[PDB]
Symmetry: C5
Subunit: 285 residues, 5 copies
Amino acid sequence: GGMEVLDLVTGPDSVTEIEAFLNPRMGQPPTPESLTEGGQYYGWSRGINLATSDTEDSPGNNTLPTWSMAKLQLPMLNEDLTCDTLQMWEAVSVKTEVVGSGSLLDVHGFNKPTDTVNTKGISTPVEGSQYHVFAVGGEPLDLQGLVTDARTKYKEEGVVTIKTITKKDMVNKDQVLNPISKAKLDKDGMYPVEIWHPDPAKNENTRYFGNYTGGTTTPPVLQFTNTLTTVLLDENGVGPLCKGEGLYLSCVDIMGWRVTRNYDVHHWRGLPRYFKITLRKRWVK
Amino acid sequence: GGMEVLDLVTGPDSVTEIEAFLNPRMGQPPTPESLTEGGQYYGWSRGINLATSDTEDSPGNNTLPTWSMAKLQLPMLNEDLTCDTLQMWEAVSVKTEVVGSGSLLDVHGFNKPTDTVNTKGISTPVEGSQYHVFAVGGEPLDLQGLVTDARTKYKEEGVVTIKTITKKDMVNKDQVLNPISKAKLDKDGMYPVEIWHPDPAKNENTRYFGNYTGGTTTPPVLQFTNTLTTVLLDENGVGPLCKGEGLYLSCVDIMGWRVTRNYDVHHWRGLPRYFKITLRKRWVK
Amino acid sequence: GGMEVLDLVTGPDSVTEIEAFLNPRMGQPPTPESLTEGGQYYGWSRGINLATSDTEDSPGNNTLPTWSMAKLQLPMLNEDLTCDTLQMWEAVSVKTEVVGSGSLLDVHGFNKPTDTVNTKGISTPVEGSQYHVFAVGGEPLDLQGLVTDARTKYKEEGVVTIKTITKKDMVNKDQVLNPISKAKLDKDGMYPVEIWHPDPAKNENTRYFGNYTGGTTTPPVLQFTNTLTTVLLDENGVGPLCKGEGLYLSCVDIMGWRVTRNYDVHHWRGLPRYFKITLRKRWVKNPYP
Amino acid sequence: GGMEVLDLVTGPDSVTEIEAFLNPRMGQPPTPESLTEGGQYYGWSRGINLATSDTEDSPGNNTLPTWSMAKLQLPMLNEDLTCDTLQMWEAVSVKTEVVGSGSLLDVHGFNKPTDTVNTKGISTPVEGSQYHVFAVGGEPLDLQGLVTDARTKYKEEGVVTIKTITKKDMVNKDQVLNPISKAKLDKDGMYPVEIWHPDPAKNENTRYFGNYTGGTTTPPVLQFTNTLTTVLLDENGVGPLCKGEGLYLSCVDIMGWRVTRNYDVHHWRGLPRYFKITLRKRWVK
Amino acid sequence: GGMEVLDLVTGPDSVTEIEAFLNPRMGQPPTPESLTEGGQYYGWSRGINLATSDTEDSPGNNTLPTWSMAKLQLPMLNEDLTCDTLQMWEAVSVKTEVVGSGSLLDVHGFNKPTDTVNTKGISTPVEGSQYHVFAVGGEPLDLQGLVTDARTKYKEEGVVTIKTITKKDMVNKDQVLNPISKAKLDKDGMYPVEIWHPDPAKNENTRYFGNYTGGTTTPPVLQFTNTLTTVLLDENGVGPLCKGEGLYLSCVDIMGWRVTRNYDVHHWRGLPRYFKITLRKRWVK
């Protein structure tokens, strides 16, 4: 009933750890798996297509990176649901890591070469805009929509956009903060990151951390270590609580773009994120 | 009476929380809403127009970003106004966040392309000068005017400039610190940020935090999390006091410019800012 | 002579606050005020003029940014200086802030345009080398001279240079550290910042803080908030003491250059700095000769 | 027996220090030592060769930087191995340092000059992508494979790649996180860094720290001091335990590339890493 | 005798301060002092000369920045050198500062101009690779040689290089870590910084702090204040001890290069460093 937080449960199995990895959702789906039928783009987006005019901007779904998310089940707790004091899982902390930055050291491929005069040098490494966000909570991540252009003609099939939610075309307010344009991160690879952002007005049971670095050729930067613990406890020493006993993990990890030798076609590059959450049982009213 | 700070008020409803979001004021007003008659520019400025000579610099009002501000009412406190000791609202801290940086990942529009020779690559993302300032206080933010050029011919109507205050043309001292050029942020979308700055000689009842990053193509950088709390208490453990029971929120969040395929026309881009302020009652003489 | 520091003075008016702002001194003097007679450059330097050869470098005075300084009078404390124990003003901390970076968001002027093909785009914003230094003390800031070129021909009148002090031309040691080349920041808008630097070997009663970022097109960066306090107390909990009851404020805040549409002429841009010093009375054993 | 941690062992020789330096493995082997037969490339990779098509990417082994590792012996502790309580070495901290950044100040060589128009200026210093990772553990560093391209044709001998482990060709999942693609850093100069990354799902007895900075001409940055100590103890005050009395040191330190005056050929540059580990004896079940 | 550190000596003169400034050694010696005979280059290096081929690299001595060092005498302490317990000087902390960055604001000289198309703008300020290292110890700084190219033909006289020490030509191992190539900083302006680096394997009685930033046109960055104290005490609260009663100061502060209007000739720029060390007497066995 009432979310009055009490003491920490002690005894056998009062604490537990949950591990999971979320692969990136840059555009090309996991299947087909064939390295000649499209599977070679897994972990990347398909070629970014440009608007044909100021009033005709329709990006393909496979060129739009979307949020990655997973809902994990935790061991059951309450036998009698009609008891005055119950138990709920509380996320204490998380060790998270973006894996694979070293693969970006491959500068021997067939990307646009650094020396275009002779088509020599090295295969230009991934560079540009970077976006890193991760969240852990007891409910789906609450999202607030905001886009660059309310006129963008996002596909009506295969993606969740503002129009999907409102059942109406976007309005000029959608380029700033429009309270009506909200959703919840309840599906993996469906909510475009250029549309949906963590909602600071909600997410009372989720902790999210994000950072953005723009630019066209900005050098990608990343740190990775198994010695860093992110505390999920709030100012009152209480972490997110799994009311429905289902843990939500959310993230997006864009490293930039690689660009081809043909018409500078850009492809987004994303990397997988690992999570290791420490949880404990909490007595609640 | 005497502004002497005493003990914190204890009991029911002694602490409260206020939320609000302030949309950016980059130049294009919220109306008309039409996505063809001007509304498509909401959240951005109109094309930046340049001076025609060293003595003719007349920027259009809709090309100048202005301060965003809001005045929020707090619940009443003092019944017997003639009491030796009264109660005042004290802002303890604020969780603030700039929302929407992910929207800058839209590089599929019709902006100046990265490969201008062939009109290929990606739509150049927002880059350049960035400005982020937020303030919370019990009175309007005190402003000190200072411009790049005292000869700039700002419109007389539609914006509040130094001449609006003094009733006289700017003088050369306005290019440095002129104590006469002062104002108060009492209106939303009216005070140009290239003219009005936080006044360090006043703002005794306001806390402001600002940073600037210049340049023409500087990569935009931004962090966002719901776990960061900004303490508003001064060296003496006392936060801003709402003397007139009206809380003031102020901000400006410029991310840079997008530039068109015609004559490199630049359009400022701003993002909305969220505020969650925690206040408590204070006993004052 | 002996500066023995004792207890803090308690009682009415034992603590005080001093405020002041120092305007930049980039090259163009405050007057003439006319916006057509030169006043339009106030806050900036005049066009930077270059050397004509490896042996002919004569920069104009109005193209050289100089140190800003002010000497503020504190309330008198001791009527008789022969007393065994006296009181002295001690600087505890300072809230300082560089005001006006927002004005650099003006990219609609007549500077060199970003689209050089069509003379469009935006008016290039101020960029380049930045220099920020501030000091608070009970004596003029002690300066150590050091220049890029000992052969530079600084004007003899209008600026205080190494020659003004030594009465002789600069030597090659002046390009590195030469103990002989020293001065004190006793005048506002007279000591070039490319010549005079805070002297680490002295300044026993002054705390200075400086930083430099070079380059030609480097993005200017600046933070400003009224919530940051700079502690002036040393490792022993003692801040600068005013032996002559005159508080000294010094600074230079260069944001970079703006460059015109004619031969890429550069003009330095400086911004004013605000100071709010908190002082307290300190009991001291008579240090008067 | 049971991996239960007890008290710290006290007495003579209860604490010790281990020193070691690991030379970089950028591509060119330590031999031949001749400065005219290839030895002049020691410390660097050989010229990076680029793919000939989107389906033909065959990097030479000597152009691929690999992990450096060393297994150091610690003095024996357990006389009677069948005892209820035994002693194990525990890594408390490490003083590590990358040596030689000052050699990058050599800008008088024969690299591509800064003034290519006239073949003048200075010899362009090492610039570009940087990668620094170091680890200390009581078992080999656990690796997770992830590549830029699952179609890359790595040599079958001379290097350990995903195929070496699985005995099958890489699949599209190998471009993201594929649980099957795992290995252990058991050989020096054999595991390419663009393939093998620290596995966050394992390494329970190893502490690793890594960072990456991409780009083509990014300035190399490095700090070095003998005053910085890296703590290896976890949240519970326990460091890595040497289960087999063998201490594992792992690292890779890429400073960027130098590029020649012929066809912009790039050569990776790596620097040696010093390790000084402090260990103490720990009572274990 | 036995270097067992005991209590801190108390009483009059048990603590003292030492000041010293070390001028940079960029290449041009202090004399000739004449500003027309070479003295005008004091504080800078002479024109950097490039290799004529992959096998002929002969840098001029005056084009190579070297380490700055000074040995300062401290007052004597022991009369009866054969007493069981003696006193020794211990370095507690140091206030160090690089002086002169403001001189880099001179952009009115005759360097390569910013506008090379018309020969206008400003005189290009010092930029590029930066290197800052300082040390304080009771013995000369221990050095480890490591070079970019073991084939570099350094002058046999006027500089101390690896061959000066080993009496033999450099080997390929010298491009990585070769334990044989070691030396001690016992002379001012003689050991090139592109060859000699602080040896982490030794320096038991010296604390050194260094940092490097590469690139060709990287903006120089520097901070300076008389309020920063660098602690020299190790983890055990003991600082460097002067075994021979002579304190060693070492440093190098390269700000980058300035380049001329002729053939882009580069000249290194160095600045002087001030040291103010606080020492105290220590009882030793």
